[PDB]
């Protein structure tokens, strides 16, 4: 029973998925950045806009 | 408000004389008769109104021949104007539309 570097190496099925997630998640964040500094942000109840 | 003596520049106090109320120095003879109305307004900060109007409040600003909202093109929407801070602020305009299979909030 052994562990090796091949037991934690990301296969191609993940490296495509991870790239999509990062691009989608960062672009959704960047829109809320724009909605705070220069527009309307739907301010959730009980908290300030920041 | 702080007002200071032209002579010595100590702080003035308000007192009462035989004909008028006076601003008076404590350390020199200088007095200034209050001849006319003088005022000083604080304008403090009011409460938030954001969570006060949400959820079918008692709004009233709607009138006959009011404009339809721009998306639905129906008059099924309320609109109001309020000061968000003290009343020296120019009043902001805001409106919300609530229709069947349609929820939106607009500015
Ligand atoms: Zn003085
Ligand atoms: Zn609607």
Ligand nearest to the CA of B3: 1
Residue B14 and residue A27: Cα distance in Å, rounded?
A: 63
Q: What residues of chain B lie within 8 A of the CB of A40, using their CB? A: 107
Other Cβ atoms less than 10 A from the Cβ of B5: the count is 19
Instruction: State this model's resolution in angstroms.
Output: 2.8
First to last CA, chain B: 39
Q: Which of A40, A43, A45 has the CB atom closest to B107's CB atom?
A: A40
Residue B73 to residues B82, B83, B104, B107: CA-CA distances in angstroms?
A: 24, 27, 13, 15
Residue B25 and residue B7 in contact, taking contact as beta carbons nearer than 8 Å:
yes
- CA atoms of A33 and B63, how far apart (whole Å): 38
CATH 2.20.25.10, domain B49-106, yes or no: yes
Q: What is the largest CA-CA distance in chain A?
A: 58
Q: Which residues lie closer than 8 Å to B66 by C-beta, 6 or more apart?
A: B75, B79
Q: Do B17 and B33 form a contact (C-beta atoms < 8 A)?
A: yes
Asked if the C-beta of A35 comes within 8 angstroms of chain B's C-beta atoms, the answer is no
B18: helix, coil or strand?
A: coil
Q: Distance from the CA of B37 to the center of ligand 1, in angstroms?
A: 23
């Amino acid at each position: 029973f052994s562990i090796g570097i091949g037991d934690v190496t990301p296969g191609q099925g993940l490296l495509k998925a991870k790239y999509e997630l990062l691009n989608a998640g960062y672009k959704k964040c960047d829109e809320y950045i724009e909605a705070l500094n220069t527009g309307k942000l739907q301010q959730q109840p009980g908290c300030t806009a920041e | 408000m702080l007002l200071f003596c032209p002579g010595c520049g100590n702080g003035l106090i308000v007192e009462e004389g035989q004909r008028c109320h006076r601003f008076s120095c404590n350390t020199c003879p200088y007095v200034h008769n209050i001849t006319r109305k003088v005022t000083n307004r604080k304008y403090p900060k009011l409460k938030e109104v954001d969570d006060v109007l949400g959820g079918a409040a008692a709004w009233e600003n709607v009138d006959s021949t009011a404009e339809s909202c721009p998306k639905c093109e129906h008059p099924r929407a309320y609109f109001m104007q309020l000061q968000t801070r003290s009343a020296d602020e120019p009043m902001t305009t805001f409106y919300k539309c609530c229709n069947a299979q349609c929820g939106h909030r607009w500015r």
